Amino acid sequence: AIKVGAWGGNGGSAFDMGPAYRIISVKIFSGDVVDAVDVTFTYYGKTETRHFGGSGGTPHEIVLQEGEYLVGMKGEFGNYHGVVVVGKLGFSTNKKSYGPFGNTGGTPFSLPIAAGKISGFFGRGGDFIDAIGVYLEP
């Protein structure tokens, strides 16, 4: 299985949501900085939820359809009052293109998947979403 990343800092303890059969929705909580993310997905028969990061920020739901896939991830990670975190996080599907969300510029990164799909998340979480990473599969 393929993992790229993670982009960001080192704060907090790690997470590894593992590959899903299909991502159903990603909800991104952001303010100044990207606080957190919610991923709902099917998993070997079971509809399953995980939350990544801390509380608060305004949420924005990315809802994935039948044909709709996570095909790209762009964001900027910077240093926010003493802590290196995801300042802006954005996603794109084969149908639309979301965000990015968050108001703290920094060192950017883009991950455009020309062939394949994002199907997982592994990273590090704190009071804000410290660093995010992706499981890739075709």
Binding residues: 38, 51, 61, 81
Which residues, 29 to 48, sit near a second copy by CB under 8 A? none
CB-CB contact of 73 with 90 (8 Å): yes
Q: Which does 38 bind (CB under 5 to 8 A by kind): Zn ion, a second copy, none?
A: Zn ion
15 binds a second copy (CB under 8 A): no
Among 33, 85, 113, 132, binds a second copy (CB under 8 A): 113
Query: Which residue number, 60 or 95, has a Cβ lying nearer to Zn ion?
Result: 60
Cβ contacts of 86 within 8 Å, gap of 6 or more: 7, 8, 33, 34, 75, 76, 77, 102, 128, 129, 130, 131, 132
Tokens of residue 3, six digits: 């993992």
Residues in the chain: 138
Alpha-carbon distance of 16 to 126, in angstroms, equals 14
List the one residue from 31, 51, 54, 108 that touches Zn ion (CB under 5 A): 51
Question: Does 103 participate in binding a second copy (rule CB under 8 A)?
Answer: no
> Does residue 26 sit in helix, strand or coil?
strand
State in angstroms the smallest separation of the CB of 20 from a second copy.
Answer: 16
CB 84 to Zn ion: min, Å: 22
Determine, following the binding rule CB under 5 A, whether residue 68 of this chain makes contact with Zn ion. Answer: no
Taking the CA atoms of residue 79, residue 80, residue 82 and residue 83 in that order, the dihedral angle to the nearest 10 degrees is: -70
Which residues contact a second copy by CB under 8 A?
Answer: 1-7, 107-116, 122, 133, 136-138
